[PDB]
């Protein structure tokens, strides 16, 4: 997978507090470029990256009308799910969707995506063939039957192989100074005694794009997988990411440990020590 485009929808009911909220976001790789929120004072598809700003009024109005139509559709799907699961109109529930395309270095489709969740649990997914469906339960088998009867997989496939890939290639060209630029991690090791007899070694990665990274500790050349604490990769707020990995080591043994860093932006993997 050299690049991807992805749309994420969350529709959330709230009985007594008006109609379900609908929010959409779009990403190229780890870069957000668009947002819609039906709770905004005036809801439209709105820019979140500088390279999308140049698209004209036809684009923004087209995307706005689709987001408006989608909010209504997902509100109905919330009503339908209650009848599928024998649930009441008094409780609050959530539908999520993720869809889109991965392209290789030469711009051709590597793979297409389209999955749904209901209350945070797998519901239905388009299979990698872009023709058949995996339902997670007997409710999602009803939807599967409906989608088979309407030839829905065919429509997605036309989109996933066609417009998805074509617009992705457009955005990569307009956003090439940032979207087609990897920023390698800045790395260092810190040392914090905890007693006379132990100390923490923490291996830091800062300032990197994209998010994907591997940090690992070796003691005497052996991976310390069960003994290493890893934090979740976290956003810095300036488009880049941060991560660390820590190990607790007997005092006097710090030089038996090496940190290893892998990232797309590095010509080769790095080895660091305290």
């Amino acid at each position: 997978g050299s690049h991807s485009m992805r749309y994420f929808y969350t529709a959330m009911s709230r009985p007594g507090r008006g109609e379900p909220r609908f929010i959409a976001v779009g990403y190229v790789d780890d870069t957000q470029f668009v947002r819609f929120d039906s709770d905004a004072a005036s809801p439209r598809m709105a820019p979140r990256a500088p390279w999308i700003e140049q698209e004209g009024p036809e684009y923004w109005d087209g995307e706005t009308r689709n987001m408006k139509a989608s909010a209504q559709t997902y509100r109905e799907n919330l009503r339908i799910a209650l009848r599928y699961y024998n649930q009441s109109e008094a409780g609050s529930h959530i539908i999520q969707v993720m869809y889109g395309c991965d392209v290789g270095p030469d711009g051709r489709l590597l793979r297409g995506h389209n999955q749904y969740a209901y209350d945070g649990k797998d519901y239905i997914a388009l299979n990698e063939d872009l023709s058949s469906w995996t339902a997670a339960d007997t409710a999602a088998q009803i939807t599967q039957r409906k989608w088979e009867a309407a030839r829905v997989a065919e429509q997605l496939r036309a989109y996933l192989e066609g417009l998805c890939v074509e617009w992705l290639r457009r955005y990569l060209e307009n956003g090439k100074e940032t979207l087609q630029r990897a920023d390698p991690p800045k790395t260092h090791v810190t040392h914090h005694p905890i007693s006379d007899h132990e100390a923490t070694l923490r291996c830091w990665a800062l300032g990197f794009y994209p998010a994907e990274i591997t940090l690992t500790w070796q003691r005497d050349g052996e991976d310390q997988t069960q003994d290493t604490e890893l934090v979740e990769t976290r956003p810095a707020g300036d488009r880049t990411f941060q991560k660390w990995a820590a190990v607790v080591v007997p005092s006097g043994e710090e030089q038996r440990y090496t940190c290893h860093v892998q990232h797309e932006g590095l010509p080769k993997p790095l080895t660091l020590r305290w």
Partner: peptide, 8 residues
């Protein structure tokens, strides 16, 4: 550019 919505 987004796709159209589907009824479950």
């Amino acid at each position: 550019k987004a796709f159209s919505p589907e009824v479950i």
